[PDB]
RNA sequence: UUC
RNA sequence: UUC
């Protein structure tokens, strides 16, 4: 079907709308640019390789390049792999880019460059030099960048990539880049704001440096600036998980009261970790457009109770005041200034790490008439006492976040305490949807009762994950939560003694009781798995990692359940050969379409398991079970089966004729098994098959009988990588078909490889030439 | 060094005292008895193989056999592997055993046999036929067993191996085996006690059957019986995790009040799961040597407050009344009859599953003057309230077990609820420190010193698996002046204060593993230097805490010998460029054992080895994804004797091991990616005694890399599951492996050629390379 | 691969 | 393999 096989080890894409020819050679263990890159290539990506040099020959034919991404071919040693350290910095020979008349974007980050590469074409609009060893900027090295708009110079001098001197920038080095819009000088050991900067700037990143003071005229001309980030100058170093040097005498970053006067267009001001003790209202006199203000990791605990500057911020959308607590102080309560009531546009307020014992309703009164408020984040505050009914006055909010507290009767796990949360990787560049969410996860709730939720009938999602709840629920504990659609009860100690647990949550659609194994681990204890009968709109049930090996009831029942996750239990014990009592455990989940019973130690499946499945089962995972054998003909009982996941098991064979085992199967996942050959007529007449994963097995040969064209050409994807292909003359059909098929097969360039014979070991089958088999 | 390579795929051992030649072929994937078994073989084990038959040829030369263990060569289908189902039962041809004149133990369990094999030698003293399909015993099939002493016939008819009929035993079938001492008919669908049994019986196992009634004389003549087990006849089926049929009409096993009168020697009586509602005192009138009584899993809740029968048991050592609760009843308290006070000899009392809300000191008063009591087990009772000070009156006890309760302000995990806890396999803790209070798996969310009032005698406290989410400051355990062992694992310890635990001045072992909760949230203070104050601490476990940050940069202890730090994030703590924690363990000056496996250490920054404490002997870096290793930095570890690098991604060994460590005895490199050894790898590494290179990708090993003067000192050399290429280049290695004195495991099964073509799959021990010497 |  |  193909006349010319693609042997280039890069992915090639065509989006002819934008007439882009996209060549992506990311992470291909290349030591030179591969031959035969399309002449029409516009976007060429070579990041994460070991190409030691660039020369005029590098891009000789590729005159239409608009973007070269040549990052991370010589990463600085602390930043890069310690098993493949770059021995010598990337060599860029003269004239390598001057011929590239249409080049708009050049990324050379992570190559141990010592200077700004010269000879760049005047079409260039974006240059990226992060994670190099360039720490002196001279105006003469920037003359070539007359038309530049975006300049990334950061991460060239910091603790992971030291230069052992202060960063140097010549006076007015950037002034004559009259088109410059984005300047990033982060993580660079800079000591002063470089001046004078071009007045076209819209974004200026100076964070994680050694700037001790702002001059009153440092930002005088920047009347188009929208984003300014000065964070991490005079850092707050307490509990920093990176080497951190504070400004002497506990001093803050010193910012004159009029330093921001020119910045009428400013939308984002980031002053995180500047050891600030006050926020002068005068800072904001001429900024009436500010939408985002980050004041986290300062020393503003007192200021939060005063906060006159908030009166100047009526258009503010997002305010972050997290981690401003005074060292060694555990306050009694949270003192929020009345000034917070003037934040009329506020959507998001975060005050983690204020550290106080008791939250009381009146303490939130400055927020009552903030009509656009959507997120209130009070996590990581060691709160011990909180009457949850106070949120009856916050039904308009989307998320109330009290996660990680000590209450008892979406941001990443590392966020406020990382060095540079915006840093680029070498490779690239949740229940809120249900409605109002109260996040009580990771607290100390050991016992719950209905009155705890009084006046909270509006809640749609309650997150109780990771509390200490070791209690037999009987249907009385959540009675006010008449509207709840999603309950996360994971990581507790639920005792399913009563089949009436949760039945007061009459609108519940999703229940997560995963990782409640405690009471399932002790022998002889009653467990009622049939508690689902009473939940009349329950769509999804998660009970993963409960170690369930016994059940008092023999059947689960539901007229609504569509999805059951039952991973990490002991169905091998429940289904011990000779014990027929639980072979219909799921049969009466009449609407069940998706069943995950992976990781259940099922080394075999007893007869009756498939007959006992509910009638509309479509998607079954038996992954990671150590399955050693499988009666494929039993799939005939699953008349609606469309996806079968058997990955990560110990199967050695496929059925003689897949089509004779299931008339419905679309998606078959067999990756990571022990299969060494396919049956002679494996896929014969499997007209419904659309997706087949045979990767990471031990297959040596595949003949055409096993893989008929009329089936192969309906496949959306066929995965064959990481097998044991034997590239002898017996393999001529397979090698030819793989080279010439239009079926999608990933990793042809990297992991569809001959293991023999001797000559061809390690060779890609796509590059294989077998003419000697045709003499 | 050997002149004749051992090619037999069995382990051969000599005990020349008892002049036993022990040949063990367990689980060697044999389809025939191998040729060349020593003619002097006395013990031959063939269990877990696929030998389809036995014939006179089988043991024809092996005239000196005293024991044949030929179990599980055709396991019943439900009991065996479903990936290798035996297609047809073991065939035993006539005359196969009659020549074995010295044969005394024959194990034929697990072979789907249909009858008792005949032609057995008159020497036989033990015959084992478990897990077969023999469910009718006729006296004529047993005449051959005149001298037999031990007869195992169980597991021939039960739910995992059904026969679909009642078991049949002919009248007096066993009577004329006048030497029979042990009879096991368990798990067999038996309906009546077989009579008459020979009076030589010392042990009789009738449990898990369908016996509804004992007759008055079922045990009339058995005055030599020491163990009787009738458990599981009329079972209590509530929450049974196996198919369980109770006797009809809620009946118990019906035992006449005089049924045990003849049993003057009886020491062990097991009546577990017999649905008993009463225990008649008259049962025990003529047995007062009884030492062990199991009454668990009956309906004896009422009886426990009465229990007049206890007055007849003054020699009882061990009593079990667990799981006697009435269905759907949550009692307020435990009513123990005064009769318990007469159990003068009692060492072990177990009453799990009584199910009551509150334990009060008065309820235990009948036990106050039992001077030999050692174990009180009240686990799995759903107790909510218990003043722990009440155990001030039980300081003589070894273990007080309140585990798995709901308290708030060694037996296996499956024991009382398994079908047959004594069943055979085909193939085959802090009590030591003193008084132990086991509070594990309760609901304790907060602790205070007064909780431990009057418990200063405690040597080991187990708080594992409670709900303790608390910053300890050194005040919480003040009364426990003698505690040597604290298990605080699986809680939510908050190490805010470096004074945590410092009141436990005698503490030698601290387990704070699986307390990750407060370590998983960013920005929180943690004081890892809390070890300073514990001046006799020898062992500290802080596994699986996800530790990735620390406010203190050094831990110090002047006593700690063992630190377990597995399952943390030293990769984050030692992030390249951050030098602050590279001495975290340096000031544990007496540290000898350090486990930092499972720490995501894909590399070790320079300075980690310099930062190790000076006396480190045993270091685990296993399961780290380590991709590179500067072997020369081991020079800093001047006392290193064990280095565990298993389950990593290393590709090379050092060029000269001897230049890396002058002391290293034990190098574990299993489960890595090593594809060849360096040219002079072990040259002059005279101190090495143990090298595990198994599960790597090694193709060839030459004598340059493996000098004989080093290899022959090894206590063990592990090489299995590699990538061996058996060409003429391999002549030295193959010859050395065949003739070596050094122990190499799995030679018979997994030291194998992968090529070339001819030899693929062939064991190197059997390899013949004469064509290389033509 | 007798639990 | 810039976090
Ligand atoms: C940032 O610049 C400072 C100097 O401004 C560097 O500090 C010097 O480092 C060298 C070698 O480490 C020392 O000998 C000097 O005494 C230091 N000077 C001062 C004033 O401290 C620092 O190393 C630079 N940071 C990085 C990450 O390169
Ligand atoms: C080798 O076989 C003999 C014969 O069965 C085993 O000896 C028995 O050992 C037990 C251990 O207490 C004694 O009670 C029996 O009376 C012995 N039987 C005799 C002496 O005939 C011996 O244990 C076996 N050894 C091995 C290693 O398999
Ligand atoms: C134990 O014996 C009983 C009979 O005493 C067996 O039960 C019979 O089983 C057959 C086939 O399943 C039925 O047709 C009979 O009706 C049953 N009889 C009775 C009285 O129930 C039982 O199968 C045997 N148990 C085992 C494990 O084999
Ligand atoms: C964002 C807070 C980081 C520092 C910290 N760490 C902890 C911790 N591990 N546990 C606590 C438990 C209760 C109260 C405060 C803290 C605490 N705190 C706050 C704290 C407040 C007060 C004190 C008393 N000096 C010590 C610590
Ligand atoms: C060994 C006990 C097996 C049965 C059982 N299972 C549980 C369980 N999962 N949680 C409980 C929680 C509190 C009290 C009793 C039980 C209980 N119980 C005891 C029990 C259950 C039910 C009742 C009647 N409400 C009384 C007592
Ligand atoms: C291709 O390069 C252009 C110019 O730098 C850029 O705008 C576009 O996003 C790139 N597209 C892809 C798919 O890389
Ligand atoms: C809150 O703090 C501010 C400034 O510290 C103070 O003026 C005010 O009185 C405080 N209010 C309360 C209720 O503590
Ligand atoms: C919590 O506040 C609610 C709402 O005003 C009130 O009804 C209730 O009494 C309070 N409960 C507690 C325990 O303070
Ligand atoms: C509940 O909170 C836990 C703990 O932070 C989190 O992992 C989980 O995703 C949350 N659940 C939902 C449904 O958002
Ligand atoms: C459920 O339990 C609660 C708390 O123990 C109790 O108040 C209520 O009476 C119980 N309800 C039923 C129907 O058992
Ligand atoms: C669950 O099963 C038990 C029997 O084990 C029964 O008592 C109970 O009524 C059942 N509950 C529901 C809701 O079906
Ligand atoms: C099948 O279910 C799995 C979850 O186990 C899901 O990830 C996958 O996308 C589903 N596939 C289809 C085709 O529905
Ligand atoms: C399998 O194939 C045979 C022969 O073609 C046919 O009789 C049988 O009905 C088939 N079974 C299924 C489920 O397709
Ligand atoms: C403490 O109890 C746990 C849980 O039952 C047990 O696993 C652990 O071994 C015990 N600790 C000691 C030191 O015995
Ligand atoms: C430790 O904390 C407990 C409980 O909070 C308190 O009673 C005690 O005074 C504290 N001890 C010290 C030495 O601070
Ligand atoms: C542990 O270190 C902290 C500071 O990091 C110090 O305040 C504390 O006293 C130290 N404690 C011990 C026992 O060394």
UniProtKB/TrEMBL annotation, chain B:
Residues linked to a glycan: 40, 43, 189, 335, 387, 462, 473, 529, 618, 659
Q: Which residues bind Ca(2+)?
A: 768
Topological relation to the membrane, as annotated: Single-pass type I membrane protein
Name the Gene Ontology biological process terms: canonical NF-kappaB signal transduction; cellular response to mechanical stimulus; cellular response to virus; defense response to virus; inflammatory response; innate immune response; JNK cascade; positive regulation of canonical NF-kappaB signal transduction
Localization per Swiss-Prot or TrEMBL: Endomembrane system; Endosome
Q: List the disulfide bonds.
A: 10-25, 72-426, 74-86, 157-163, 234-247, 237-244, 430-460, 726-753, 728-772
Q: Which GO terms describe its cellular component?
A: early phagosome; endolysosome membrane; endoplasmic reticulum; plasma membrane; receptor complex
> What Gene Ontology terms describe what this protein does at the molecular function level?
double-stranded RNA binding; metal ion binding; pattern recognition receptor activity; single-stranded RNA binding; siRNA binding
Keyword list, A-Z: Calcium, Endosome, Glycoprotein, Immunity, Inflammatory response, Innate immunity, Leucine-rich repeat, Membrane, Metal-binding, Receptor, Repeat, Signal, Transmembrane, Transmembrane helix
Binding residues for guanosine? 382, 406, 494, 525
* Similarity-based family: Belongs to the Toll-like receptor family.
Q: What is this protein called?
A: Toll-like receptor 7
Question: Gene symbol?
Answer: TLR7
Residue range from the parent sequence: 27 to 835 of 1049
């Amino acid at each position: 079907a193909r006349w010319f096989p693609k042997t280039l080890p890069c992915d090639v894409t065509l989006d002819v709308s934008k007439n882009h020819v996209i060549v992506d050679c990311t992470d291909k263990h290349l030591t030179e640019i591969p031959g035969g890159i399309p002449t029409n290539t516009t976007n060429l990506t070579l990041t994460i390789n070991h190409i030691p040099d660039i020369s005029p020959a590098s891009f000789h034919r590729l005159v239409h390049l608009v973007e070269i991404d040549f990052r991370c071919n010589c990463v600085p040693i602390r930043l890069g792999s310690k098993s493949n350290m770059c021995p010598r910095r990337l060599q860029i020979k003269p004239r390598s880019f001057s011929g590239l008349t249409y080049l708009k974007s050049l990324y050379l980050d992570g190559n141990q460059l010592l200077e700004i590469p010269q000879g760049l074409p005047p079409s260039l609009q974006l240059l990226s030099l992060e994670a190099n060893n360039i720490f002196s900027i001279r105006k003469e090295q920037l003359t070539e960048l007359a038309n530049i708009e975006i300049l990334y110079l950061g991460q060239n001098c910091y603790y992971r990539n030291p230069c052992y001197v202060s960063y140097s920038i010549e006076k007015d080095a950037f002034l004559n880049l009259t088109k410059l819009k984005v300047l990033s000088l982060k993580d660079n050991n800079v000591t002063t704001v470089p001046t004078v900067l071009p007045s076209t700037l819209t974004e200026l990143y100076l964070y994680n440096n050694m700037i001790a003071e702002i001059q009153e005229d440092d930002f005088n001309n920047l009347n188009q600036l929208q984003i300014l980030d000065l964070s991490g100058n005079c850092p707050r170093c307490y509990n920093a998980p990176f080497p951190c040097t504070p400004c002497k005498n506990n001093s803050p970053l010193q910012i004159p009261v009029n330093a921001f006067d020119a910045l009428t267009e400013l939308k984002v001001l980031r002053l995180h970790s500047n050891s600030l003790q006050h926020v002068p209202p005068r800072w904001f006199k001429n900024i009436n457009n500010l939408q985002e203000l980050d004041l986290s990791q300062n020393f503003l605990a007192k200021e939060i109770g005063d906060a006159k500057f908030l009166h100047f911020l009526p258009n503010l959308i997002q305010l972050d005041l997290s981690f401003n607590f005074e060292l060694q102080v555990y306050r009694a309560s949270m003192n929020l200034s009345q000034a917070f009531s003037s934040l009329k546009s506020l959507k998001i307020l975060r005050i983690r790490g204020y550290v106080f014992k008791e939250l009381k309703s009146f303490q939130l009164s400055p927020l009552h008439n903030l009509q656009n408020l959507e997120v209130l984040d009070l996590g990581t505050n060691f709160i011990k006492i909180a009457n949850l009914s106070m949120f009856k006055q916050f039904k308009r909010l989307k998320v109330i976040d009290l996660s990680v507290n000590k209450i008892s009767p979406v941001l990443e796990q590392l966020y406020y305490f990382r060095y540079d949360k915006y840093a680029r990787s070498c490779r690239f560049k949740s229940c809120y949807k249900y409605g109002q969410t109260l996040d009580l996860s990771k607290n100390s709730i050991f016992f719950i009762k209905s009155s705890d939720f009084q006046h909270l009938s509006f809640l749609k999602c309650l997150n109780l994950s990771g509390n200490l709840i070791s209690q037999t629920l009987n249907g009385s504990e959540f009675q006010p939560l008449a509207e709840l659609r999603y309950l996360d009860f994971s990581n507790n100690r639920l005792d399913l003694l009563h089949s009436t647990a949760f039945e007061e949550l009459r609108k519940l659609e999703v229940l997560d009781i995963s990782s409640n194994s405690h009471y399932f681990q002790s022998e002889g204890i009653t467990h009622m798995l049939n508690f689902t009968k009473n939940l009349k709109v329950l769509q999804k049930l998660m009970m993963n990692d409960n170690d369930i090996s016994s059940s008092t009831s023999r059947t689960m029942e539901s007229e609504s359940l569509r999805t059951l996750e039952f991973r990490g239990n002991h169905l091998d014990v429940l289904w011990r050969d000779g014990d027929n009592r639980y072979l219909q455990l799921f049969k009466n989940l009449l609407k069940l379409e998706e069943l995950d019973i992976s990781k259940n130690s099922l080394s075999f499946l007893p007869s009756g398991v498939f007959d006992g499945m509910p009638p509309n089962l479509k998607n079954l995972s038996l992954a990671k079970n150590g399955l050693k054998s499988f009666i494929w003909e039993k799939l005939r009982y699953l008349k609606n089966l469309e996806t079968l996941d058997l990955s990560h098991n110990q199967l050695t064979t496929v059925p003689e004729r897949l089509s004779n085992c299931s008339r419905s199967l679309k998606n078959l996942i067999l990756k990571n098994n022990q299969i060494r050959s396919l049956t002679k007529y494996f896929l014969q007449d499997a007209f419904q098959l659309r997706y087949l994963d045979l990767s990471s097995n031990k297959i040596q040969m595949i003949q055409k009988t096993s893989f008929p064209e009329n089936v192969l050409n309906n496949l959306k994807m066929l995965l064959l990588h990481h097998n044991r292909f034997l590239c002898t003359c017996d393999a001529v059909w397979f090698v030819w078909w793989v080279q010439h098929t239009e079926v999608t097969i990933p990793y042809l360039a990297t992991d569809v490889t001959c293991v023999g014979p001797g000559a061809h070991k390690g060779q890609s089958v796509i590059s294989l030439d077998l003419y000697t088999c045709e003499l």
